Amino acid sequence: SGEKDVVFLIDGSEGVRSGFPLLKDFVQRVVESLDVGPDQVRVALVQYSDRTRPEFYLNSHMDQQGVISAIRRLTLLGGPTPNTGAALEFVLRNILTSSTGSRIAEGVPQLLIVLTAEPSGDDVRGPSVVLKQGGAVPIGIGIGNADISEMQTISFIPDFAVAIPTFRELGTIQQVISERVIQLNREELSSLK
């Protein structure tokens, strides 16, 4: 993979309560495929609903076992709606920063994996533009009642968006999502607009 910064942005609103254990499994499984280390892949995770709660930053746990432990202990944030736009902007402002471990200034890809299961409670259009202008490379994964149109808007290019019918089908895309993290590189990303 070379070096990558990978941020998981996870909808923790009421709509995901039932599916949350499977969401945690999926994230763990993606991380199991990566070479996590201070000099390799760094991982961060944020939950969101009507507010955004960082769980860990890119420099919080820089070995795989520790990142996996942090994922396993996650508890549902809770909340009435997924304000996905506000959460995207929070990530750009507060997570993709040198001071919290991001290698953005050195040209390391900033991969953002967004997992949500409802239509956004806020407008994602404006935030999506800002995020991509700011150097984030998002992959929007919309589960269940999420809108693939919103995932297309959020994603680095529309074709990065993924729809899956149910939380139980997250396993079916773990391999392809891992491979994106591993295979995406700075120059290839630049070539895509």
Residue numbers in the entry: 1022 to 1214
Manuscript excerpt for this entry:
Collagen VI is a ubiquitously expressed extracellular matrix protein that forms a structurally unique network of beaded microfilaments. All collagen VI chains consist of a relatively short triple-helical region as well as of N- and C-terminal globular structures that are largely made up of VWA domains. Von Willebrand factor A (VWA) domains consist of about 200 amino acid residues and act as interaction modules in many intra- and extracellular proteins, e.g., in copines, integrins, von Willebrand factor, complement factors B and C2, matrilins, and collagens. The collagen VI α3N5 domain structure is the first solved structure of a collagen VWA domain and differs from other VWA domains in having an extended C-terminal region comprising residues N1206–G1224.
One of these missense mutations, R1064Q in human (R1064Qh) that is located in the N5 domain, was found in an UCMD patient (Lampe et al., 2005). To gain insight into the UCMD causing mechanism of the R1064Q mutant in human, the equivalent mutation R1061Qm in mouse was inserted into the murine collagen VI α3N5 domain by mutagenesis PCR and the crystal structure of the corresponding recombinant protein was determined at 1.2 Å resolution. The overall structure of the mutant VWA domain is very similar to the wild-type collagen VI α3N5 domain with an rmsd of 0.54 Å. The most significant structural difference is around the C terminus where the α6 helix of the mutant has a small angle with respect to the wild-type leading to a 1.5 Å displacement of the helix in the C-terminal extension. Poor electron density after residue L1213 in the mutant precluded the unambiguous assignment of the remainder of the C-terminal extension residues K2014–G2024. The residue of the R1061Qm mutation is preceding the beginning of the β2 strand and is located near the N terminus. Comparison of the wild-type and mutant structures shows that the side chains of the wild-type arginine and mutant glutamine are surface exposed and are pointing in approximately opposite directions while the remainder of the local conformation is the same. The crystal packing of the R1061Qm collagen VI α3N5 domain is different from the wild-type. While the arginine residue in the wild-type is in close proximity to the α2α3 loop of the neighboring molecule, the glutamine residue of the R1061Qm mutant interacts with the C-terminal part of the adjacent molecule (data not shown). The charge difference in the mutant and the difference in crystal packing also indicate the possibility that this mutation may alter intra- or intermolecular interactions and therefore disturb the assembly of collagen VI.
